[PDB]
């Protein structure tokens, strides 16, 4: 069949349209400042014609779309931004190739179309709302349709049916007309939430459409029944401008974006979440795409807005499915393991979650240890008994030995002062900061001025965090209270003071007392027992009532009403 | 004596509590405007509230609008602002004193905004901006400018500025005294909506809903149809700022617009501090009083759209 | 030990699984542009409690935040964005959206608690950005602070979890691009309290094959640092500061295992920083431990 | 919108929404003599085995002043 490789060429002006003929050797590039014809020979692009020779920079040549007929290799048709439709007749003796200049539209024209077989038909859609159907031999004149929606965006002739064409409107509707009855459409339905930019028919099916819109979506519709049904739905990452079906593969598409995104994607509608391929050669937004031949599914031509034109080979794309990470892994706190992996490596579109149930000594040592209150010897014996009863023998021997060294000529004043430090560092290096911190707290002042100030802080902070993970606030606060470093000791002192006011006079209350300064009334009245509360006071933030800590607690487990009787359901249950 | 010094009090009775009553004569537009204002100034977002009110103060002081500046400084004091900041621009931090260059260009000469300004704003350093933080500020500045223009245009009564501005004598210069912006290469509906939606979604939705309320607003006493002279005024005000449409024939502008209206539009848009009562009364002598408000609303929308399109094109050129 | 299965009900592949700070919640993200949150009951069974569409492209990673700031999650996607979610009294709402990237965002990570509320993100264009929330009472005001620029495409990042006042903040970033040349794939950046900027500190020359994940180790007691890398094999490094610009380190190598005879995809330490878990293409999880003679053995082979 | 006072045991800011929706264990609680507060459940659990104010450098027997 055909042969070629990836190649590109640089143009003179940006292009925003493209079209191919039934030779697969020629291509048309149109834009605001360019109208050329190129040749795809075997290794490069060669530029034959330049249909702007005779440069009168009229606004009749600012093309927005261009089509090439597929019956006669000589007809062409462009759509301008003035409202003019020009038909060119390449096989003409003169240098200019203009033939006709229909000027029946008032506003901008967006799309043009040709009939696949009958080589005298045109279809044009404009921004006014109407769409016209010229006849390129001046017989029977024009025939006008009205959509009554908005500016129209696209127009396409059906491949199997002979007399049917489709339209796409800016409000989000899709209609379906027959050209022998320009009086009422044969269907209408809402497709997208917003403008619909593109549509396409299936080369092989009989009722399959494909619409793309500004809401970043590509839908496929079935029209063999009486009502339109939606089968598939592809969710891209930007707005969609063009949609083309791949030849000979009835589940493939090709899309390009209208903003932000410069790539070209090929989707498979049975896997809408991940693209099957992506070409990322351009450096600006792509404007037009086209498959070369209706029977070779390996060639794609694109024209972008960086003055470039390229041909792509499907066997050279960047497949992103086989460039990803197939599994995830995490380690828990209680020793659990979470592992999810693909269903092709474990036992190609699903995964398999599984938790493996792979530190009781930590939580049992934390609660049973004694730190302050008694002198050294009994604390050491208590800790040794605990450690021995848990099964850790070396720790118990360390606790016992630490009593003989302190709690007891002679040996020199501090003969062991250089070994307790090594023991503490030995225990802290393995990750057991519990032992080091406990020993530091118990000993107190005999080992204090030996360890650097930035190491005690590290050891205390790590221990506090590990304790807070397991939700043991009593031990954490006990450590904070007896900490040897000021920075740790100042942790539960910042912003833990409450300000309370008397609700009769709305005045602040003094720091120590239960009688108001102006009202001369006691305000810490218990709402259950009707006594004076000098200690702990519970409070409800909804109705501003409360009392003793253990009175309200017992009242609220038998009723669901504020005991002061204000019609409040204090727990909202 | 009542709401507006130009519209008679009896007319307002028959047809910031003053602007809200003069703008209420077209109900379907007031709701959308209030929704956008509430989103832009009260709902939580990428910028702090006090910074937002300071941005509003800076933007309203370009056109020398006392009403808005007073209201916004009153609001700024009560949200937790620094009273020291109200002595001048030179007391604010070096992250708000960067928007002061884009301020002039958006207010006076939109066509000079390029990608280098965006690069200067987003360049790495010790006090930088993010994309969301800056796209909010741009919309806020445009909103305040247009509001000032409308407030001066309708002549609203109440119930310093030179310290909040750099280069006080810039002003407006005519366009023809630079390439033309073709309104088919970069359109709001196809190009700007998508970008503003990706970078700031709710604001984009609200702006698109507000743009469609100033289009479906009929004219009662025309004498072609309402859709024609509306197009004429819209295209004229866009052409003032440097945007030309390809499909529109520009001859009909004179045949559809009286020469008296053509000066009121330019005065209220380009130099809104010089509008006066005689100007208000010269044009459309024998017409209802609720149309010279519709003209102002159209003008406000057009100015907003022009400035936003220029800024968005700059950002898109930067990011490509 | 014992393995129990979970019904995920995801329409495509799962790319990340994350635990929380108290160990009783879990989050999963998939390529169907969705995020799910699971809870554990008294009977010991996991059941879903929320699921909502999060992005417009494939979601790669999802991470938790410290419970001091609330219940917060962060995500990254193929649509070049990062989002912050919070749970209010029970559905999850969106708080912010970071849109400075020009290409796909690959990983997201929360900073250790003692620096505040910071977030770091990495892209496929080679740029790493660090954000901050100066006021914790509004979770919708983030501000860009620093911006590093590597020479290759990033794939993973990791913070140093040490909490000492003698260690300066550092972050390690790895690449994944396959090139015919031979360039270093792992770099380490360090913070300078004097100049107030992140500066290059070291470069792991020996690593040349593409990297897929890296992870520091939980310090808890030590004076040096441990780093784990998941290339074609499993590698473990050690960085010890030298006595006193960027601090000078002495980089060594302490372990290398080709026991997977495949490509290694993920690595994960444990809460104490003593056991390393790795996953590979074969489909098995392996556990590594070190004795008192500094040799790294194997401890178990878990198979799904 | 500024932080409310924080609990003395879990070091997490206090608050209550305004099935159960505000249970008893999350209510405010404070001594009326030294004005140091915390969660109801946290303080109830603390004052079982100890008797002194959880905040450092305090002296109240905050539960013995009533019983
Ligand atoms: Zn009182
Ligand atoms: Zn009582
Ligand atoms: Zn009550
Ligand atoms: Zn109550
Ligand atoms: Zn007390
Ligand atoms: Zn106290
Ligand atoms: Zn608490």
DSSP string, A402-471: HHHHH----S-TTSSTTTHHHHHHHHHHTT-HHHHHHHHHHH-SSSGGGS-HHHHHHHHHHHHHHHHHTT
Tell whether A570 is in a known binding site.
yes
Residues contacting A490, CB < 8 A, separation 6+: D56
> Is residue B77 within 8 Å of residue B83, measured between CB atoms?
yes
Q: Which of C49, C104, C48 is nearest to C78 (CA)?
A: C104
Cβ atoms C10, C34 nearer than 8 A: yes
Residue with tokens 């709302």: A129
Beta bridge partners of A286: A304
Instruction: Please tell me which chains touch D, using 3 or more CB pairs under 8 Å as the contact test.
Output: A, C
Q: Is B45 on the interface with C (CB under 8 A)?
A: yes
SS3 assignment for A301-367: EEEECCCEEEEEEHHHCCCCHHHCCCCEEEECCCCCEEEEEECCCCCCCCEEEEEECCCHHHHHHHH
Between the CA of residue B43 and those of A366, C114, C296, what are the distances in Å?
A: 48, 30, 56
Distance from residue A529's CA to the centre of ligand 2 (Å): 4
C-alpha of A216 from chain center? 14
Residue A184: count other Cβ atoms within 10 Å of its Cβ: 11
- According to DSSP, the β-strands at B243-244 and B181-182 are parallel
How many beta carbons lie within 10 A of that of residue A46, not counting itself? Answer: 10
- Catalytic residue, candidates B65, B144, B154, B270: B65
Closest ligand to Cα A510: 1
Residue A173 CB coordination number (10 Å): 19
Q: Which two tokens stand for residue A528?
A: 């259950």
Cα separation, C237 vs B109, in Å, equals: 59
Query: Residue C90, exposed/middle/buried by CB under 10 A (0-12, 13-18, 19+)?
Result: exposed
Judged on CB neighbours under 10 Å (0-12, 13-18, 19+), D39 is buried
Report CB contact under 8 Å: D36, A497.
Answer: yes
The whole-angstrom separation of Cα C237 and Cα C255 is: 7
D39 among annotated binding-site residues? yes
What does the angle CA D61 – CA D64 – CA D66 come to, to the nearest 5 degrees? 130
> Do residues C75 and C83 touch, judged by C-beta distance below 8 A?
yes
> Residue A554, class by beta-carbon neighbours within 10 Å (0-12 exposed, 13-18 middle, 19+ buried)?
exposed
Residue B87 is given by DSSP the state: G
Q: What six digits make up the tokens of A379?
A: 């604390």
User: Which residues 15-44 of D are in CB contact (within 8 Å) with A?
Assistant: 16, 18-24, 27-38, 40, 42-44
| Exp. method | cryo-EM
For residue C154, CA distances in Å to A530, C106, C107, C175 come to 68, 8, 9, 4
The C-alpha atoms of residue A571 and residue A540 are separated, in whole angstroms, by 9
What CA–CA distance (Å, rounded) separates A561 from A569? Answer: 5
Closest residue by Cα to residue A132 from A85, A176, A198, A192: A85
A17 close to A81: Cβ distance less than 8 angstroms: no
Cα-to-centroid distance, A536 and ligand 5 (Å): 8
For residue A12, count CB atoms less than 10 angstroms from its CB and return exposed for 0-12, middle for 13-18, buried for 19 or more. exposed
Length of chain C: 304
- Of B274, B284, B191, B268, the C-alpha closest to B236 is B268
DSSP state of A277: E
Alpha-carbon distances of B61 from A378, B113, B148, rounded to whole Å: 78, 20, 9
Ligand 6: distance of its center to the CA of A537 in Å?
13
* Backbone CA torsion sign across C44, C48, C50, C56: positive
Q: Show the tokens assigned to B206.
A: 């609200």
Q: Is the dihedral of CA C221, C224, C229, C233 positive or negative?
A: negative
Do C137 and D1 lie within an 8 Å CB cutoff?
A: yes
Min CA distance, D1 vs chain A (Å)?
16
CA of A514 to the centre of ligand 6 (A): 16
Reduced to 3 states (helix: H, G, I; strand: E, B; else coil), residue A220 is: strand
- Label the pairing between strands A123-126 and D28-31: unpaired
What is the DSSP track for B33-48?
HHHHHHHHHTS--SS-
Give whole-number Cα distances, C170 to A312, C167, C189, C197, in Å: 44, 9, 6, 11
Question: What is the spatial distance between Cα A267 and Cα A278, in angstroms, rounded to a whole number?
Answer: 9
CB contact under 8 A, D12 and C138: no
Contact A332, C19 (CB under 8 A): yes
- Min Cα separation A506/chain C (Å): 28
C-alpha separations of C63 from A330, B290, C24, C74 in Å: 11, 57, 15, 5
Interhelix angle for B201-211 vs B292-319, to 10°?
Answer: 140
Q: Which residue of C has its CA nearest to A339?
A: C17
Q: Indicate the residue of C68, C89, C137 with minimum beta-carbon distance to D2.
A: C137
C-alpha to C-alpha distance for B314 and C12, rounded to whole angstroms:
39
A500, A502, A549 from A523: Cα distances, Å: 10, 6, 16
Terminal CA-CA length for chain B:
55
Q: After which residues is chain A broken (C to N over 2.5 A)?
A: 347, 358, 408
Phi-psi region of A328 (alpha: psi -120 to 50; beta: other; left: phi over 0): beta
Q: Hey, are the CB atoms on D22 and A489 less than 8 Å from each other?
A: no
Closest CA to C40 of C24, C57, C16: C24
DSSP state, A94?
S
Q: Name beta bridge partners: A331.
A: A337
Residue B129 near residue B97 (C-beta atoms within 8 A): no
The C-alpha R_g of chain D, in whole angstroms, comes to 13
In three-state form (DSSP H/G/I as H, E/B as E, the rest C), the secondary structure along A225-257 is: CCCCEEEEEECCCCCEEEEEECCCCCCEEEEEE
SS3 B146: helix
Closest partner residue to A497 (CB to CB) among D35, D42, D57 is: D35
Question: What tokens were used for C19?
Answer: 């635990």
Distance from CA of A347 to the nearest CA of C (A): 8
d(CA B105, CA B103): 6
Residue B239 bears catalytic tag: no
DSSP string, chain C: --EEEE----SS-EEEEEE-TTSSEEEEEETTSEEEEEEE-TTS-EEEEEEEE--SS-EEEEEE--TTS-SEEEEEETTS-EEEEEEE--EEEEEEEE---SS-EEEEEEPPGGG-SEEEEEETTSEEEEEE-S-TT-TT--EEEEEEE-SS-EEEEEE-----TTS--EEEEEE----SS----EEEEEEETTTTEEEEEEE-TT--SPP-EEEE---SS-SSEEEEEESSSEEEEEEEEPP--PPPEEEEEEEEE-TTSS-EEEEEE-TTS--EEEEESSSEEEEEEE-TTS-EEEEEEEE-
Query: Which spans in B42-108 are helix H?
Result: 49-60, 66-77, 99-107
Q: Let me know if A95 is exposed, middle or buried by CB neighbors in 10 A (0-12, 13-18, 19+).
A: exposed
Beta strand D37-39 pairing with B181-182: unpaired
Q: Is A545 flagged in the annotation as binding?
A: yes
List the chains bordering chain A where 3 or more Cβ pairs fall under 8 Å: B, C, D
Q: Which two tokens stand for residue A17?
A: 């349209």
CA of C67 to the centre of ligand 7 (A): 13
């Amino acid at each position: 069949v055909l042969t070629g490789r990836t190649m590109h060429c640089h143009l003179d002006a940006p292009a925003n349209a493209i079209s191919v003929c039934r030779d697969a050797a020629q291509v048309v590039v149109a834009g605001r400042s360019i109208f050329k014809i190129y040749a795809i020979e075997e290794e490069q692009f060669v530029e034959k014609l330049n249909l702007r020779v005779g440069r009168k920079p009229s606004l009749n040549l600012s093309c927005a779309d261009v089509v090439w007929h597929q019956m006669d290799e000589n007809l062409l048709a462009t759509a301008a931004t003035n409202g003019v439709v020009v038909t060119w007749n390449l096989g003409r003796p003169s240098r200019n190739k203009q033939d006709q200049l229909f000027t029946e539209h008032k506003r901008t024209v967006n799309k043009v179309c040709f009939h696949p077989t009958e080589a005298h038909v045109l279809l044009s859609g404009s921004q006014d709302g109407f769409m016209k159907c010229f006849d390129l031999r001046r017989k029977d004149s024009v025939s006008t349709f009205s959509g009554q929606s908005e500016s129209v965006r696209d127009v396409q002739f059906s491949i199997r049916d002979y007399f049917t064409f489709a339209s796409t409107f800016e409000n989000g509707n899709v209609q379906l007309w027959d050209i022998r009855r320009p009086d009422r459409c044969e269907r209408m339905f809402t497709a997208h939430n917003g403008p619909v930019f593109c549509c396409d028919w299936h080369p092989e099916d009989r009722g399959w459409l494909a619409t793309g819109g500004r809401d970043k979506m590509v839908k496929v519709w079935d029209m063999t029944t009486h009502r339109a049904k939606e089968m598939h739905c592809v969710q891209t990452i930007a707005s969609v401008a063009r949609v083309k079906w791949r030849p000979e593969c009835r589940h493939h598409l090709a899309t390009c974006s209208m903003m932000v995104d410069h790539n070209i994607y090929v989707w498979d509608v049975r896997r809408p979440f991940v693209p099957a391929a992506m070409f990322e050669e351009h450096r600006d937004v792509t404007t037009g795409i086209a498959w070369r031949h209706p029977h070779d599914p390996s060639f794609l031509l694109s024209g972008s807005k960086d003055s470039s034109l390229c041909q792509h080979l499907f066997r050279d794309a960047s497949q992103p499915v086989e460039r990803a990470n197939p599994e995830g892994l995490c380690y828990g706190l209680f020793g659990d393991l979470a592992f999810a992996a693909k269903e092709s490596l474990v036992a190609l579109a699903s995964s398999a979650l599984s938790v493996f149930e792979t530190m009781r000594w930590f939580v049992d040592t934390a609660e049973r240890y004694a730190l302050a209150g008694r002198p050294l010897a009994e604390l050491c014996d208590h800790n040794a008994k605990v450690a021995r009863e848990l099964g850790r023998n070396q720790v118990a021997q360390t606790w016992t030995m630490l009593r003989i060294i302190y709690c007891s000529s002679r040996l020199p004043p501090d003969f062991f002062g250089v070994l307790v430090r090594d023991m503490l560092h030995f225990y802290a290096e393995q990750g057991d900061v519990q032992m080091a911190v406990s020993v530091l707290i118990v000993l107190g002042e005999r080992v204090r001025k030996d360890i650097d100030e930035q190491t005690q802080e590290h050891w205390y902070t790590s221990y506090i965090d590990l304790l807070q993970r397991f939700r043991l606030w009593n031990v954490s606060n006990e450590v904070v209270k007896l900490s040897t470093s000021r920075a740790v000791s100042c942790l539960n002192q910042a912003s833990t003071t409450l300000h309370v006011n008397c609700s009769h006079c709305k005045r602040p209350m003094s720091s120590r007392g239960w009688v108001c300064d102006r009202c001369h009334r006691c305000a810490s009245m218990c709402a259950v027992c009707h006594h004076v509360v000098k200690g702990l006071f519970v409070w409800c933030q909804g109705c501003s009532h409360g009392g003793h800590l253990q009175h309200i607690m017992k009242w609220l487990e038998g009723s669901s009403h504020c005991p002061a009787g204000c019609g409040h359901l204090c727990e909202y249950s | 004596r009542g709401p507006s010094a130009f519209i008679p009090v009896e007319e307002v009775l028959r047809e910031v509590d003053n602007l809200a009553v003069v703008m209420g004569l077209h109900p379907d537009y007031f709701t959308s405007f209030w929704r956008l204002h509430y989103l832009l100034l009260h709902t939580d977002g990428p910028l702090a509230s006090s910074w937002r009110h300071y941005i509003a103060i800076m933007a309203a002081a370009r056109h020398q609008c006392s009403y808005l500046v007073g209201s916004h400084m009153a609001e700024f004091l009560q949200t937790g602002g620094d009273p020291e900041w109200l002595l001048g621009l030179h007391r604010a931090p070096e992250k708000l004193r960067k928007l002061s260059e884009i301020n002039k260009l958006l207010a006076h000469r939109p066509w000079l905004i390029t990608k280098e300004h965006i690069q200067a704003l987003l360049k790495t350093g010790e006090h930088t901006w993010s994309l969301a933080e800056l796209i909010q500020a741009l919309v806020l500045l445009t909103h305040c400018h247009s509001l000032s223009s409308f407030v001066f245009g309708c002549g609203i009564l109440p119930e310093d500025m030179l310290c909040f501005v750099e280069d006080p004598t810039f002003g407006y210069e005519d366009f023809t005294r630079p390439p033309t912006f073709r309104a088919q290469d970069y359109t709001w509906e196809d190009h700007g909506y998508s970008l503003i939606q990706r970078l700031y979604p709710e604001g984009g939705q609200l702006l698109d809903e507000k743009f469609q309320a100033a289009y479906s607003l009929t004219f009662n006493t025309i004498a072609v149809d309402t859709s024609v002279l509306r197009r004429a005024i819209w295209n004229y005000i866009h052409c003032v700022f440097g945007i030309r449409y390809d499909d529109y024939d520009y001859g009909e502008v004179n045949q559809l617009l009286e020469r008296n209206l053509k000066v009121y539009i330019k005065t209220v848009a380009c130099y809104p501090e010089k509008t006066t009562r005689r100007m208000y009364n010269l044009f459309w002598r024998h017409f209802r009083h609720s149309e010279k408000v519709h003209v102002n609303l159209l003008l406000l929308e057009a100015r907003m759209q022009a400035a936003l399109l220029y800024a968005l094109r700059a950002i898109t050129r930067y990011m490509t | 030990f014992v393995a129990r299965s979970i019904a995920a009900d995801h329409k495509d592949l799962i790319h990340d699984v994350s635990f929380d700070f108290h160990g009783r919640r879990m989050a999963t993200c998939s390529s169907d542009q969705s995020v799910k949150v699971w809870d554990k009951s008294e009977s010991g069974d996991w059941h879903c409690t929320a699921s909502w569409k999060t992005h417009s492209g494939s979601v790669w990673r999802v991470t938790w935040a410290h419970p001091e700031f609330g219940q917060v999650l962060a995500s990254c996607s193929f649509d070049r964005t990062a989002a912050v979610w919070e749970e209010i009294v029970s559905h999850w709402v969106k708080r912010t959206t970071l849109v400075d990237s020009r290409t796909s965002v690959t990983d997201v990570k929360f900073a250790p608690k003692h620096m505040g509320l910071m977030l770091a993100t990495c892209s496929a264009d080679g740029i790493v950005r660090i954000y901050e929330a100066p006021d914790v009472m509004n979770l919708s005001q983030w501000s860009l602070q620093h911006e590093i620029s590597c020479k290759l495409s990033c794939s993973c990042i990791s913070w140093n979890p040490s909490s000492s006042r003698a260690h300066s903040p550092m972050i390690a970033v790895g690449s994944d691009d396959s090139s015919p040349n031979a360039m270093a794939k792992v770099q380490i950046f360090e913070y300078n309290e004097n100049t107030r900027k992140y500066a290059k500190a070291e470069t792991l020359m020996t690593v040349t094959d593409p990297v897929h994940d890296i992870a520091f180790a939980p310090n808890l007691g030590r004076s040096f640092h441990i780093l784990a890398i998941a290339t074609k094999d499993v590698r473990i490094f050690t960085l010890k500061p030298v006595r006193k610009g960027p601090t000078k380190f002495e980089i060594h190598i302490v372990a290398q295992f080709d026991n997977h005879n495949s490509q290694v995809w993920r690595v994960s330490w444990n809460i104490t920083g003593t056991v390393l878990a790795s996953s590979g293409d074969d489909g098995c999880v392996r556990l590594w431990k070190a004795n008192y003679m500094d040799n790294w053995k194997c401890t178990g082979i878990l198979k799904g | 919108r500024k932080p409310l006072p924080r609990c003395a045991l879990c070091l997490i800011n206090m608050g209550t929404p305004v099935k159960k929706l505000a249970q008893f264990n999350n209510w405010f609680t404070w001594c009326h003599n030294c004005r140091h507060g915390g969660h109801a459940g946290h303080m109830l659990s603390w004052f079982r085995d100890h008797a002194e104010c959880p905040v450092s450098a305090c002296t109240c027997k905050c539960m013995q002043l009533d019983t």
